[PDB]
Amino acid sequence: ERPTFYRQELNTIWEVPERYQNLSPVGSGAYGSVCAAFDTKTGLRVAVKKLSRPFQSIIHAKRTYRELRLLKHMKHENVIGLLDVFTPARSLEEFNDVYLVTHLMGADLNNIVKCQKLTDDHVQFLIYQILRGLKYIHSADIIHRDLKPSNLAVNEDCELKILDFGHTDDEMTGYVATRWYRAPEIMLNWMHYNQTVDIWSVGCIMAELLTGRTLFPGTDHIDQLKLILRLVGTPGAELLKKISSESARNYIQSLTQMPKMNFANVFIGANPLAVDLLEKMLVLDSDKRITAAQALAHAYFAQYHDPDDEPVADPYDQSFESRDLLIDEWKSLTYDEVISFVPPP
Numbered sequence: 001e002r003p004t005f006y007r008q009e010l011n012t013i014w015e016v017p018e019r020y021q022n023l024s025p026v027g028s029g030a031y032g033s034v035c036a037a038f039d040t041k042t043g044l045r046v047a048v049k050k051l052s053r054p055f056q057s058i059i060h061a062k063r064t065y066r067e068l069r070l071l072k073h074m075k076h077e078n079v080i081g082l083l084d085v086f087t088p089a090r091s092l093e094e095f096n097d098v099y100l101v102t103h104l105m106g107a108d109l110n111n112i113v114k115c116q117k118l119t120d121d122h123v124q125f126l127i128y129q130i131l132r133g134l135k136y137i138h139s140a141d142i143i144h145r146d147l148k149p150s151n152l153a154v155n156e157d158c159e160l161k162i163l164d165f166g167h168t169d170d171e172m173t174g175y176v177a178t179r180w181y182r183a184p185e186i187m188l189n190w191m192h193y194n195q196t197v198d199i200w201s202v203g204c205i206m207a208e209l210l211t212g213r214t215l216f217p218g219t220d221h222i223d224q225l226k227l228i229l230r231l232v233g234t235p236g237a238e239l240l241k242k243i244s245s246e247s248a249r250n251y252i253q254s255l256t257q258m259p260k261m262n263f264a265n266v267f268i269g270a271n272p273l274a275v276d277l278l279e280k281m282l283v284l285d286s287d288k289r290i291t292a293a294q295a296l297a298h299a300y301f302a303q304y305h306d307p308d309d310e311p312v313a314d315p316y317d318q319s320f321e322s323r324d325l326l327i328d329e330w331k332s333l334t335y336d337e338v339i340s341f342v343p344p345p
């Protein structure tokens with residue numbers, strides 16, 4: 001049955017089912033503003049995202065469909081999930097707004113690191129959960145592509161969820177956290193990239209949790225690359241071949257060759273098992289990076305690793321990605337997905 005909706009001006013008029021009370025602006029998220037609220041039906045504190053102009057263009061309509069598809073698929077402890085999706089619309093003809101509901105999270109990882117070192121046990125637990133969530137995400141052939149501490153949310157008990165999985169040129173420019181966790185092959189568009197871009201990001205995050213400091217705080221793309229290459233060495237012939245961009249490969253070759261540094265001398269005092277994992281994650285050749293599944297079985301996570309409690313995802317059909325459709329067709333697909341939603345247990 002259709003719930004009763006009530007109206008409220010927040011951020012824009014918000015029209016939500018009565019179950020959602022005490023709506024309070026919480027800021028911005030991916031492609032829309034977020035409100036905290038109390039779900040009287042479940043007793044949960046929730047985050048409610050209203051999408052801004054979900055169907056104003058083909059790009060927007062497809063993006064709307066994409067986010068809804070991704071959130072409906074994800075059913076994992078360490079990945080943001082969909083508690084509810086609703087529209088005040090009674091039909092496709094009047095359908096123009098989409099609201100997404102998930103758990104309200106207490107803080108992001110930026111708030112926790114706060115210029116300070118975490119204990120080795122904290123790093124173990126936090127990275128373990130990230131890799132557990134990434135194993136799940138990657139098993140569905142989904143790539144986050146933009147993992148960073150601000151996308152990693154935690155509750156009081158340090159229970160972690162990954163948000164915003166699956167940025168303009170300007171916001172990737174300069175001394176910005178938006179670029180600091182990006183694998184070099186995506187930062188400078190070396191090649192058709194895969195899942196392991198996210199493992200690079202995990203290495204950057206893990207090192208930051210260990211030192212309290214940004215691993216590669218480049219002032220720009222070029223500065224960041226030099227920072228990266230100083231640690232991991234300049235690419236060898238083998239990797240150079242795989243750089244399908246003639247232009248990028250040519251620039252790479254202009255740089256003075258540097259050997260990989262000793263990670264034990266970079267990360268003084270750190271668990272040698274942590275050092276070892278960082279070495280396996282922060283490999284320039286993405287083909288050779290440790291995967292999430294492999295990293296979970298690494299000795300560093302001995303006290304958390306359970307092969308029987310690290311689930312994979314159901315198959316995720318993303319054939320729509322290569323599909324060209326009109327606005328109203330993307331809208332109709334989105335509508336179907338809203339209508340068909342079944343709330344989690």
Ligand SMILES: Cn1c(=O)c(Oc2ccc(F)cc2F)cc2cnc(NC(CCO)CCO)nc21
Nearest residue numbers: 029047048049100101102104105106107108153
């Ligand atoms: C920033 N942000 C979102 O963009 C966000 O996006 C959504 C995704 C899917 C969805 F169905 C609904 C959403 F709102 C959810 C969300 C939940 N908790 C929190 N809590 C934050 C504390 C700030 O009060 C800390 C983590 O940033 N922030 C969120």
